[PDB]
Write a protein that binds this ligand. Structure first.
Ligand code: HEM
Ligand code: HEM
Ligand SMILES: Cc1cc(N)nc2cc(-c3ccc(OCC4CC4)c(CN)c3)ccc12
Ligand SMILES: Cc1cc(N)nc2cc(-c3ccc(OCC4CC4)c(CN)c3)ccc12
Ligand SMILES: C[C@H](O)[C@H](O)[C@H]1CNc2nc(N)[nH]c(=O)c2N1
Ligand SMILES: C[C@H](O)[C@H](O)[C@H]1CNc2nc(N)[nH]c(=O)c2N1
Ligand SMILES: [Zn+2]
Lengths: 410, 416
C-alpha cells in the first residue's frame, strides 16, 4: 500500500511508494517499534540474486533496462559468481553504488548532496602502507584548504572474512583520550579505549588535550599498523566566541574534516569493510555532542561558569544557555576560518527540500526522525514536524563489529 | 516474538531487559520492513459485539485480580462470571469503582508518549458515570478544575463520564483541552490569539459564543451528553489560574503582555478499559515548561514570538548561523519557568522531568518487566541531547488500558 507522510507545519502531504522496494528488515514488528534502538560472509547461493537485484537497479537507473549491455552484464556476473565465489563491480557500478548508499542512509540529514560524492577506487590496495597512502590522498582531496568536498575511498571487498581490510579508527581524524590516574579523562573521552590500543601497539602519546590519533590500518587480515597523518594535512579550527573574548582562553579547537571510517559498505551482495567517507560538519555534531555529552568533553559547566550563570538549580536552564553559546562559537570559528560547516537550521531546511525532491523523482525518502532531528532546538527546525518513514534500501552503509573483537592476532 | 528484549542507555551503559512487551495488545503501525515511529497517528454505529467484548473483558479482569494478588480467587471467578452474564444479557458491562480506578491509572501508566508517568499511581479519579446532561458535565468539570488547580499546588486528576453504548449516545467534550485560548482568523490572513484553536473557536462562535476577540480569551466548554447536540458553558474565571510571563533579567519581557494558564487538561482523548470506551475522560496534570515555552510560544503555527523576543534582545536575525532563534527560545523558556515558580504554580523543567522519567523507567523495568516509551515524544523539543532520555533506548508498544485518539466530534456528530 501507498503511505502518506504529513508535515504538520506546512500541511504538505507526500506519498511513499519507494518503501515497497525494500527487502532488509528494520527490527520493528506490528506490535513493537524499535525506532530508537541504535542497532536492532556470503555464498554463491545467496550472492547472485543480490547481484541481479543491483545490476537491474543500475541499468534501470541509466535508462537501459533489458538492454544488450544489461543482459550481457547479468550473464557476465553469473559466470563469475560460479567460477570465483564472488564478482567484481565495474567502476561505473562502484560509483553508482557508493552514491546510492549515501542516498539511502536514513539517518543522514546531509543527503541533499548525495550525488556530489568523489569516489576513490582503492580496490587494488594490498598493504597497510598502501591504505595509508590512499587515506592521505583522501584527507588532502576532501579537505581542499577548507572548501571541503565529500569523498569516499573504497578498499578491497571481503573475501572469506579472514582477509578483511579494516580501518581500526572510528574516524580518520579524532583526538586521543587519556584515562587519568585520578579517575577522570584528559583529551576526548569517546576514544579512551582506542587510544589505549594505540599505546599498546607502540604509539607514543603526547598526552595533550588535542592529540590527533594515529591511523591504525589493517590490510588483507594482517595485524594493523600505525601511521601518523602528516600534520599539514589536518585542518583545525581554534574555537572562539564572537562576543565572549574569554572563550578563546578555554584553549579549545576541533578538526575540520569529519570522516567516518568504521562502517561497512554493501553493494550487490559485496561487502566493503574499509570505506572511509567524509563530508563536512553540521555544527551541533561538535558543539552539542562532542563537547557537552556527559561521556565526552563535558565543557558545559565551565562555559556557564565564565558566563556567571546561576548553576544551583536546573530550572535556570544554565545548561541550555551555555549549549547555545558553545554552538554559536563553533559556527563562528569555522566560518571565520572559511572552513565548510552547516548550521542545524540550514541543514534541516535543506533536508526538507531534499525530501520533496526524492518523493517527486524517486517515490520516497527513507529517513530516521530520531537521528534526523538535531540534538538541540529540535522543534524550531522544520524536520521536527515532518513525518518520516524509515525503511532499509540497498546499497547501504551498515555497522560492523569493532575489529579488536574479531581479529586473530599473530 | 522473542521473549526478552534489551534496551541500552548509551551514556551510563545500563542495560535493561523487557518482558512486558509480550502483553502488547494493539498494533504500532510498524511492520518488519517499515518503521512508522514518527507518524503522529498510525464508524459511529460500530461498537464492540458480544463476541469481541468477552475476551477483552476477561483479559482486563484477569489483569486486575492479578494486580491485587487475588488471581484465581473466588472473588475473581465470581467477577468473571458476573461480567460474562452482563455481556450476555445486555451486550455490555459496568466496571466496579475499584476497576475503574485501576484502569484509569494504568491507562496513564501505559501511555508511551507521557514523560510524566512517575506520578501515575497518584491520580485522583472522579467517577462521573451517573452524569446525564451537559449541565451535569459542566458541574463535574468545574469541580475537576478547582480540585486539580488547588490554588497552584496542582494535583493530577481524571473525570470519567459514561461509556459508549450504541455509539449514538456518546458523551464528548468538544474542547481539546478544558482550558485553551481562542484563536481568531482575521480578514487579512493574520491570527489573533492562539492559531492552534482557530477551528474550534469558529465552531464555538457558530454555536452562539460571543467572543471577546483578545489575545488570551479562555474558550467556553462545548459539552455533549448522551449523544445530544453540544451546549456552551463559560468556565467561572476565578477557577482559571493564569501566570503572566516575566523574565528574571529582562525587564522588557513583561511588556510582551504574555500569560498562560496553569492547568493542562486534555479532554479529547478516549479511555479504553476492558473493551469499554469512555469517550469523555478529561485528565490533567501540570506542565513541563517546554510545552509552553517551546511549543505554545515558539512554534510557527502557534504564538510565534521568537522574532519579537529576538528583536528586544538585539540579536542579528539576518543569518541563521548566529543561532538567534536558539538564543531566544532559551530565554522564553527561562521566563516561563521563572513566572510559574514565582507565583507558586507547579511546573517542571525538562531536565528534572526527563531525569525522573529515567528513574521511573528503570523502576518499571525492575518491578513490571518493562515500560513502553515513545522516544520521539519523550525527548523534549529543545536541548534534547543534554537530557538523559536522548541516549536512552526505548521500546514502544501498546498496552491496555490505554488512552486513544478519536475523531473530532464535529466530524461525526449527527445533529438533532
Ligand atoms: C556532506 C555533508 C554531510 C553532512 C552535513 C552530514 C550530516 C550528518 C549528521 C549530522 C549525521 C548524524 C551524525 C550524528 O549525530 O552522530 C549523519 C549521519 C550519517 N551520514 Fe551524513 N553528513 C554528510 C555527508 C555524508 C557522506 C558524504 C556520507 C557517505 C558517503 C554520509 C553518510 C552518513 C551515514 C551512513 C550516517 C548515519 C550512520 C548510521 O547509520 O549510523 N554522510 N550525517
Ligand atoms: C503530572 C504531570 C504530567 C506531565 C509533566 C506530563 C507530561 C507530558 C508531556 C510533556 C507530554 C507530551 C505533550 C506534547 O508534547 O504535546 C505528555 C503526553 C501525554 N500525557 Fe502526560 N503529563 C502529566 C500528566 C499526565 C496525566 C495525569 C495523564 C493521564 C492520566 C497523562 C497522559 C498523557 C498522554 C495520554 C499523553 C500523550 C497522548 C498522545 O498523544 O498519545 N499525562 N505528557
Ligand atoms: C560523512 C559525515 C559527515 C558528518 N558531518 N557527520 C557524519 C556523522 C556520521 C556518524 C555515523 C554514526 C555515528 O555513530 C553511531 C553511534 C554514535 C555511535 C556517528 C557518531 N560520531 C556519526 C557519519 C558520517 C558523517
Ligand atoms: C495530562 C497532561 C499534562 C501535561 N503537562 N501535558 C499533557 C499533554 C498531552 C497531550 C497529548 C497529545 C497531544 O497532541 C496530540 C496530537 C499532537 C496533536 C498534545 C498536544 N497538545 C498534548 C496530554 C496530557 C497532558
Ligand atoms: C512529525 C513528528 O512525529 C511530530 O512533530 C511529533 C514529533 N514529536 C513530538 N513530541 C512531543 N512531545 N510532542 C509533539 O507534538 C511531537 N510532535
Ligand atoms: C538512544 C538513541 O537512539 C541514541 O542516543 C541516538 C538518538 N538520536 C541520535 N541522533 C543523532 N543525530 N545522533 C546520535 O548519536 C543519536 N543518538
Ligand atoms: Zn518502528
Amino acid at each position: 500500500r501507498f503511505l502518506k507522510v504529513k508535515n504538520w507545519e506546512t500541511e504538505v502531504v507526500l506519498t511513499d511508494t519507494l518503501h515497497l522496494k525494500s527487502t532488509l528488515e528494520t527490527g520493528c514488528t506490528e506490535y513493537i517499534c524499535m525506532g530508537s534502538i541504535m542497532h536492532p560472509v556470503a555464498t554463491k547461493d545467496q550472492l547472485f540474486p543480490l547481484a541481479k537485484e543491483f545490476i537491474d537497479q543500475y541499468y534501470s537507473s541509466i535508462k537501459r533496462f533489458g538492454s544488450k549491455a544489461h543482459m550481457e552484464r547479468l550473464e557476465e556476473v553469473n559466470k563469475e559468481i560460479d567460477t570465483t565465489s564472488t564478482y567484481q563491480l565495474k567502476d561505473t557500478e562502484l560509483i553508482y553504488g557508493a552514491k546510492h548508499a549515501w542516498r539511502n542512509a536514513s539517518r543522514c540529514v546531509g543527503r541533499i548532496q548525495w550525488s556530489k560524492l568523489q569516489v576513490f577506487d582503492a580496490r587494488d590496495c594490498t598493504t597497510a602502507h598502501g591504505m595509508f597512502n590512499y587515506i592521505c590522498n583522501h584527507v588532502k582531496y576532501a579537505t581542499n584548504k577548507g572548501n571541503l568536498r565529500s569523498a569516499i575511498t573504497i578498499f578491497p571487498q571481503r573475501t572469506d572474512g579472514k582477509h578483511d581490510f579494516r580501518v581500526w579508527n572510528s574516524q580518520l581524524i579524532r583526538y586521543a583520550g587519556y584515562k587519568q590516574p585520578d579517575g577522570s579523562t584528559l583529551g576526548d573521552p569517546a576514544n579512551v579505549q582506542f587510544t589505549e590500543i594505540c599505546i599498546q601497539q607502540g604509539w607514543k602519546p603526547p598526552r595533550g588535550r588535542f592529540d590527533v590519533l594515529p591511523l591504525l590500518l589493517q590490510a588483507n587480515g594482517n595485524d594493523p599498523e600505525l601511521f601518523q597523518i602528516p600534520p599539514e594535512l589536518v585542518l583545525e579550527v581554534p574555537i572562539r566566541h564572537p562576543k565572549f573574548e574569554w572563550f578563546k582562553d578555554l584553549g579549545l579547537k576541533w578538526y575540520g574534516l569529519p570522516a567516518v571510517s568504521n562502517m561497512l559498505l554493501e553493494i550487490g551482495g559485496l561487502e566493503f569493510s574499509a570505506c572511509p567517507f567524509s563530508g563536512w560538519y553540521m555544527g551541533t555534531e561538535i558543539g552539542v555532542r562532542d563537547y557537552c555529552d556527559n561521556s565526552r568533553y563535558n565543557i558545559l559547566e565551565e562555559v556557564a561558569k565564565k558566563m556567571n550563570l546561576d548553576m544551583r538549580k536546573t530550572s535556570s536552564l544554565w545548561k541550555d544557555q551555555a549549549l547555545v553559546e558553545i554552538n554559536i562559537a563553533v559556527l563562528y570559528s569555522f566560518q571565520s576560518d572559511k572552513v565548510t560547516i552547516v548550521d542545524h537550521h540550514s541543514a534541516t531546511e535543506s533536508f526538507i527540500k531534499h525530501m520533496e525532491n526524492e518523493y517527486r523523482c524517486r517515490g520516497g525518502c527513507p529517513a530516521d526522525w530520531v537521528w534526523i532531528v538535531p540534538p538541540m532546538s529540535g522543534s524550531i527546525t522544520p524536520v521536527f514536524h515532518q513525518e518520516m518513514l524509515n525503511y532499509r534500501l540497498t546499497p547501504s552503509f551498515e555497522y560492523q563489529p569493532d575489529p579488536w573483537n574479531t581479529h586473530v592476532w599473530k
